[PDB]
């Protein structure tokens, strides 16, 4: 009963599609080419029919011949159409045949090596981990020396990707078959001299080793630095770049401790910074940046100062491998503690500044990021008032395109510093500076949006000072009417609202407020939420009535927009009408309030959390302001309307009224709406306890007794929809009284608990079963288990599978904690059934 | 494998149940602290005795038709 | 009604959730007082699997947490609390 | 408010000026180092010089 097939599968397709006999007439074993059908039995199929083939072939496979299986199970994967689930099932099942068929690999070598070695050079990350992890496996499979066999005669592909697959295969094959195992033998084979591709691919196969393992190159790492430093002193170029760059990922795998073997080759590390030409120089430098880190705190500034001649010399880059190489190197001396911020400054400052610093890199995505990250980095070292005084004209220059990456750099800086190195001068000039860029925004520019929130903030007492500054710049960019211009200022505005707003003014609030509720029927919805956004910023800032829009203009107003089915439009319209009710809260009738919770009381269930979240913020206080009494009754009459589609959420808004106000405001008036003799009143009223006390929290403890005979009566053999509800209001308020001393009325409820557990509803289990699974974890099992021991061995076998499955279910939780509440299972003749190991006096 | 070992069901028998009970019992006497300084005081006898017993103990308590 | 879950080896992978299904537990299933974070074993977040949801079983918008309610339980130190069974298997629609 | 509006309106234009007098200043900058650099003149080819 396999799903439909596929016309993708027609490779091996005609077996349970024709009629491919091959137990009938076929040559020896054709049953294993059906078995790779059993693969699409695999591939299409359900998960226990798919591992069932693979369990089976894991006691087939040496019974299958290994040049059919490979030529078979090969091909298969190697094709395009193979998936990702199905990548990942093709490698399991060459993984288990590789274990099956171990010595059987060697004859294969040559297939995977040629499949496999593309794979582990793809894209993804996940193909290159497959891609590995199946050579791993075939390497496993056979010796080591067939692997050294195997990758040593691949050497002759001229072929630059040949080349580096093969080198990528063979740090593959010994990342796993033992570094040392394959040290001696590539040691040996790489050593000669007979041409550049040899000397190139030993430096490669042992940076793909150092790459593929890691942190593992510590013991390893003289090992493998005694083969390397042949290339050092190489007389052909590309020999010394392959030895350097495999120093380099030998010492970023190996770092930032154990620099021990770095030493055998730290001096023509050291020496030749200003030695090489061109590559040369280039791979000495990069080797160099990774060296220094690691490097100890004594010969770092020798190492420093002698790569200084040829670093800060050849600071302007003519290409990019150059500029990139010495951004990196700049990034990794800054990082060591060896050089000080004071020779930085002195001989790294300057030039830094003077071939760095500056608007030349303007379109250079990847030199945009680099500097910039090398910028942050440094600042924190030669402090951010020495670069805040130097950095305030990149960014109020005319040109956009560097004042974009000038503002990211200073934004940077002052979140890594902070506000602390920031001088009256070099302030006056950071800020001019950035409202220079935040006016002059041509471009869809975020970086100074994004920047002016953090200039604020590290304003902070003396944004005071300059408030009409920004005061006129936030005027300018609101008042333009351009759509992105209000929604970038409408940003900036609450971005920096607490900070300017909260300056202790009331001069701004009513020129703020009056522009504020101006645009208030913005069509776009973004701009919409952003004006929201601000006003709430204003409203948490401002007072009644010291805010400009009346309160009792604003409510209205903000009324029909709570009704909008934006997202972040209503997400941020519920926190600005829950704020409207936050200080003095009055302002507004209560109808009006009334009809606003009816309308949001819908919202309590959307999909995005943070509505749901924002509706239970705002109803606490609008419940709160409105009153207790009146929202119960609201709410209750609410109970009967809205059937169960949205029903429930309402409940939960009286469950807001129980985290809103005492337990004593929902309890006594909900307990009186029980009298009613219809079945669903009183069952919508236990549905309702139930997220009362399962979110009532710790404050059940405080009343509990009292609603103990409300929900005993509910319990009672009264229906098959009434008896879920009750269990359910007990399990969730035994988790919230857990430990607090509410046992009593605990013990109260199981009695009557208990007997419902005899109940052939398949619904209806659950509803009791997570009752007792509550009460084992909240009431110890000394006594749940002390109910279900009379019945444990009961002759009825359709009553022992109710007492089992609550013992169960009382056994992985409470371990070893039930094991001291067993009874004293007297001695049969036949065995030794007492603990007698318990009963010790001492 | 750990679906469910340590208790059986419906129909587990008497001895079974036992067997179950004193392999999860000694279990909480090898790793926990008072119930293990307390029975080396009531047999006189080594933490590393008393374990090395109760571990020997495990193959079949309780009287094992073996 | 009764969904499945992976229950292996609890890894060191982060728990996710859907857009729609990202305040309920995973086993739980409850919006009330999120307790811990749910986790995932080694066939939950591999290749296709980065950064999916334990519930809606798509596109992950925050992380997997447990109930208040199923954390004091001790329902979260099971398996992989991963919400597939027999229908919602590796190959499903 | 009739006087305050005119106030901030010519608060405004004198920040404008200064901004204008900042460029200024910024674009005489560019033409006195124009004169001279600069790290080596156009320094971009003279480290590549081929390859
Ligand atoms: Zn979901
Ligand atoms: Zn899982």
Redesign the pocket.
């Given at each position: 009963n396999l799903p439909f097939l596929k016309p993708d599968d027609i490779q091996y397709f005609d077996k349970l599609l024709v009629d491919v006999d091959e137990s009938t007439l076929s040559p020896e074993e054709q049953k294993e080419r059906k078995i790779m059908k059993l693969l699409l039995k695999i591939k299409n199929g359900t998960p226990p029919m798919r591992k069932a083939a693979l369990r089976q072939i894991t006691d087939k496979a040496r019974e299958f011949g290994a040049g059919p299986l490979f030529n078979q199970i090969l091909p298969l994967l190697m094709s395009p159409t193979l998936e990702d689930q199905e990548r990942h099932l093709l490698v399991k099942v060459i993984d288990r045949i590789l274990y099956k068929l171990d010595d059987l690999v060697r004859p294969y070598v040559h297939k995977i090596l040629v499949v496999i070695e593309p794979l582990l050079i793809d894209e993804d990350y996940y193909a290159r981990v497959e891609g590995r992890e199946i050579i791993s496996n075939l390497a496993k499979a056979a010796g080591l020396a067939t692997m050294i066999s195997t990758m040593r005669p691949d050497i002759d592909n001229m072929d630059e990707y040949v080349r580096n697959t093969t080198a990528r295969a063979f740090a593959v094959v010994a990342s796993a078959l033992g570094i040392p195992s394959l040290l001696p033998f590539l040691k040996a084979v790489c050593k000669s001299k007979k041409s550049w591709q040899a000397r190139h691919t030993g430096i490669k196969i042992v940076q793909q080793i150092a790459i593929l393992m890691g942190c593992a190159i510590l013991p390893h790492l003289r090992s493998l630095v005694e083969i390397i430093e042949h290339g050092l002193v190489d007389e052909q170029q590309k020999v010394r770049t392959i030895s350097a760059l495999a120093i380099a990922a030998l010492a970023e795998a190996a770092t930032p401790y154990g620099i021990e073997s770095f030493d055998s080759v730290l001096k023509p590390l050291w020496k030749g910074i200003r030695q090489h030409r061109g590559k040369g120089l280039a791979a000495f430098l990069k080797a160099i940046g990774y060296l220094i880190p690691l490097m100890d705190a004594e010969y770092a500034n020798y190492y420093t100062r002698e790569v200084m001649l040829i670093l800060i010399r050849e600071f302007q880059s003519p290409d990019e491998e150059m500029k990139k190489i010495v951004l990196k190197v700049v990034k990794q001396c800054c990082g060591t503690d060896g050089v000080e911020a004071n020779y930085i400054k002195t001989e790294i400052l300057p030039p830094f500044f003077k071939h760095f610093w500056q608007h030349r890199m303007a379109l250079d995505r990847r030199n945009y990021r680099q500097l910039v990250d090398t910028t942050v980095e440094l600042a924190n070292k030669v402090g951010a008032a020495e670069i805040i005084s130097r950095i305030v004209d990149d960014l109020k220059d005319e040109a956009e395109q560097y004042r974009k990456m000038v503002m990211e750099t200073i934004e940077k800086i002052m979140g890594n510093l902070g506000a602390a190195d920031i001088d009256h001068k070099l302030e006056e000039q950071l800020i001019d500076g950035i409202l220079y860029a935040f006016q002059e925004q041509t471009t869809e520019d975020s970086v100074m949006l994004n920047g002016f929130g953090t200039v604020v903030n590290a304003l902070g007492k003396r944004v005071k000072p300059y408030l009409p500054q920004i005061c006129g710049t936030v005027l300018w960019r609101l008042n333009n009417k351009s759509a992105k211009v209000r929604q970038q200022a409408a940003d900036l505005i609450s971005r920096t609202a607490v900070v300017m707003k909260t300056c202790q003014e009331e001069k701004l609030m009513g020129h703020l407020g009056v522009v504020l509720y101006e645009y208030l029927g913005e069509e776009y919805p973004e701009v919409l939420g952003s004006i929201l956004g601000a006003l709430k910023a204003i409203v948490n800032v401002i007072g009644m009535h010291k805010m400009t829009p009346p309160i009792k203009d604003l409510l209205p107003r903000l009324t029909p927009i709570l009704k909008n089915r934006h997202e972040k439009v209503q997400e941020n319209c519920i926190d600005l009408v829950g704020r409207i009710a936050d200080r003095g809260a009055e302002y507004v009738s209560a109808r009006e309030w009334m009809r606003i919770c009816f309308e949001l009381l819908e919202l309590l269930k959307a999909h995005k959390k943070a509505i749901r979240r924002a509706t239970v913020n705002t109803f606490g206080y609008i419940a709160k302001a409105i009153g207790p009494h009146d929202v119960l009754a609201t709410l209750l009459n609410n109970l009967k309307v809205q059937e169960r589609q949205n029903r429930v959420c309402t409940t939960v808004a009286i469950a807001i009224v129980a985290e809103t106000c005492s337990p004593f405001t929902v309890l006594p008036a909900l307990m009186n709406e029980y009298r009613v003799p219809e079945l669903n009143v009183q069952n919508g009223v236990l549905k309702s306890l139930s997220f009362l006390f399962e979110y009532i929290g710790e404050m059940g403890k405080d009343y509990i007794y009292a609603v103990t005979p409300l929900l005993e009566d509910a319990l009672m053999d009264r229906d098959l929809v009434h008896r879920q509800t009750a269990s359910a209001v007990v399990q969730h308020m035994s988790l919230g009284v857990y430990g607090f001393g509410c046992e009593d009325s605990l013990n109260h409820l199981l009695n009557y608990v208990w007997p419902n557990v005899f109940e052939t509803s398949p619904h209806v289990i659950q509803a009791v079963m997570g009752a007792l699974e509550g009460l084992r974890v909240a009431i110890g099992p000394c006594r749940m288990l002390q109910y279900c021991l009379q019945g444990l061995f009961h002759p009825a076998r359709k009553v022992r599978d109710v007492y089992w499955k609550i013992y169960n279910s009382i056994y992985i939780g409470s371990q070893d904690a039930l094991i001291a509440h067993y009874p004293r299972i007297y001695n049969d003749d036949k065995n030794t059934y007492i603990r007698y190991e318990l009963d010790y006096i001492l | 494998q750990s679906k469910y070992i340590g208790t059986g069901h419906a129909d587990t028998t008497k001895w079974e149940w036992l067997v179950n009970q004193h392999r999860d019992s000694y279990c909480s006497y090898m790793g926990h602290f008072d119930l293990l300084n307390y029975f080396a005081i009531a047999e006189n006898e080594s933490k590393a005795r008393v374990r090395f017993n109760l571990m020997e103990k495990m193959l079949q308590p309780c009287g094992p038709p073996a | 009604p009764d969904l499945i879950?992976?229950?292996?080896q609890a890894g060191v992978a982060i728990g996710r959730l859907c857009e729609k299904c990202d305040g309920k537990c995973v086993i739980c299933d409850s919006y009330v007082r999120p307790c811990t974070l749910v986790r995932?074993?080694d066939?939950?977040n591999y290749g296709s699997y980065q950064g999916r949801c334990v519930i809606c079983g798509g596109p992950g918008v925050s992380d997997a947490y447990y109930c208040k309610e199923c954390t004091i339980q001790e329902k979260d130190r099971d398996?992989?609390?991963?919400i597939?069974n027999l229908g919602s298997s590796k190959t499903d629609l | 408010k009739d006087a305050g509006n005119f106030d901030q309106n010519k608060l405004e234009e004198e920040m404008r000026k200064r901004k204008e007098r900042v460029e200024k200043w910024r674009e005489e900058q560019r033409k006195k180092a124009m004169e001279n650099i600069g790290e080596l003149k156009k320094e971009i080819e003279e480290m590549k010089q081929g390859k």
């Open positions: - | - | 879950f992976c229950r292996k995932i074993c066939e939950c398996g992989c609390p991963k597939v | -």
